[PDB]
């Protein structure tokens, strides 16, 4: 049961598909190849809580319905550089203009 998700950190966003039977660690490995940082330096979060390596994606709550291709679920990322793991900071997307009047 493939789940579709967005992995975001700072101004970076990754769009990837994973199985519900896969784990945080397997997904941290996915981050490796793409972003060239080892799993030891990655913390992956659902909302504000760390996802423990070895918990299946469904367990983490990334249910098939919750993470859909049209509306992907966000898996947070923060990188551990040197002394401390960094605080989670996912920058927001641009704010849309005001709806034009004709549409209003």
């Amino acid at each position: 049961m493939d789940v579709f998700l967005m992995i975001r950190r700072h101004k970076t966003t990754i769009f990837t598909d994973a199985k519900e039977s896969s784990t945080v660690f397997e997904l941290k490995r996915i981050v490796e190849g793409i972003l060239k940082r080892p799993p030891d330096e990655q913390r992956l979060y659902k909302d504000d809580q760390l996802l423990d390596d070895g918990k299946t994606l469904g367990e983490c709550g990334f249910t098939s319905q919750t993470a859909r291709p049209q509306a992907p679920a966000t898996v947070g990322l923060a990188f551990r550089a040197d002394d401390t793991f960094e605080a989670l900071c996912i920058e927001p997307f641009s704010s849309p203009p005001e709806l034009p009047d004709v549409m209003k």
Binding site: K11, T13, F15, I34, L35, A71, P96, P97, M103
Partner: protein, 90 residues
């Protein structure tokens, strides 16, 4: 697989599988006359984010007998998304 980077006007970076990005003929060309990166000076993140979601949606549900969900487009982004679409030919 192979990935590519699509960057918005406001500087957000989106990493998408190449085959997903190749959904757009315009992105294909930009990719080939090296860097696997493309910069969109006129597409803001709240549009380009939605474009990447479309890439995911088309690939999964193209040539599939699963019931196809409706692609959600909010009103406040629709006009900008249309503009981006016409340019990207997706």
């Amino acid at each position: 697989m192979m990935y590519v980077k699509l960057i918005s006007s406001d500087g957000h970076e989106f990493i998408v599988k190449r085959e997903h990005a190749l959904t757009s003929g315009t992105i294909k060309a930009m990719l080939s006359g090296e860097t696997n990166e493309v910069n969109f000076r006129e597409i803001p993140s709240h549009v380009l984010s939605k474009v990447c979601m479309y890439f995911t949606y088309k690939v999964r549900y193209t040539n599939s007998s699963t019931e196809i969900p409706e692609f959600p487009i909010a009103p406040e982004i629709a006009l900008e998304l249309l503009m981006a679409a016409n340019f990207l030919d997706c």
